[PDB]
């Protein structure tokens, strides 16, 4: 296997170069924002991000080994988590604001344009504040995002061994980063814990976000793309 043979540095470098680009929105900012128009922009944005995510996942060490069916399964489970932690990471140095796109920066006030969305906005904002407070590094971020991909759908499931092996490798990678940063063994454990506990909240935001998407769909506010409907029809 290719993933297990890599060192921590080769792991980080591989993940860093596999990073998807930051996409732009079609936000022409002379329009104030309708609940439909808001959902229209976000859906079109997220739909284009999904394409890049799928090709990013194929560049995640060990993901290539899996069967198609497992690949599909892991992506169907974690796609909104990946989108959200990516959004939170982009919005890190924009306090009280969410950077969906460089031309689309929103605070929680604009999140009130869509019913049932401002609660999710506040959770995403709080996560961003947490990343800011922890002084999260990009090397740690790409590790967390890869952990989400491999872990989120692993208990819905022969070789779950290989996935856990790669997970243990990414764990070793995270510890190495904290070690080189000059953190003591106690600080390395604690920061590792603090980082992984975020994933619990990212899972929560995704689940609440998943339900809100099924709402907008059945509320017929703005029609969803064929790809997004597939991802949603995999999560109830």
């Amino acid at each position: 296997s290719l993933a297990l043979s890599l060192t921590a540095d080769q792991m980080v470098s591989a993940l860093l170069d596999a990073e998807p680009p930051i996409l732009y929105s079609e936000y022409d900012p002379t329009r104030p924002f309708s609940e439909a128009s808001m959902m229209g922009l976000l859906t079109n944005l997220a739909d284009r991000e999904l394409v890049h995510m799928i090709n990013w996942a194929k560049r995640v060490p060990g993901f290539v080994d899996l069967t198609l069916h497992d690949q599909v399964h892991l992506l169907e489970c974690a796609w909104l988590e990946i989108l959200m932690i990516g959004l939170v990471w982009r919005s890190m140095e924009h306090p009280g604001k969410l950077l969906f796109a460089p031309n689309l920066l929103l605070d929680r006030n604009q999140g009130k344009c869509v019913e049932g969305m401002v609660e999710i906005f506040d959770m995403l904002l709080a996560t961003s504040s947490r990343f800011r407070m922890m002084n999260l590094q990009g090397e740690e971020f790409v590790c967390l995002k890869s952990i989400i991909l491999l872990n989120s759908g692993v208990y819905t499931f022969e070789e779950k061994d290989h996935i856990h092996r790669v997970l243990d490798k990414i764990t070793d990678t995270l510890i190495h980063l904290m070690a080189k940063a000059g953190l003591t063994l106690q600080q390395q454990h604690q920061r590792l814990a603090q980082l992984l506990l975020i994933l619990s909240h990212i899972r929560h935001m995704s689940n609440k976000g998943m339900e809100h998407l099924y709402s907008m769909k059945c509320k017929n506010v703005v029609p969803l793309s064929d790809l997004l409907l597939e991802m949603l029809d995999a999560h109830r």
């Binding site: 394409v51 799928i54 194929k58 690949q71 599909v72 992506l75 169907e76 597939e230």
Partner: peptide
């Protein structure tokens, strides 16, 4: 599924 096709190529 679009996901399967995109994962292929």
């Amino acid at each position: 599924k679009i996901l399967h096709r995109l994962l292929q190529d």
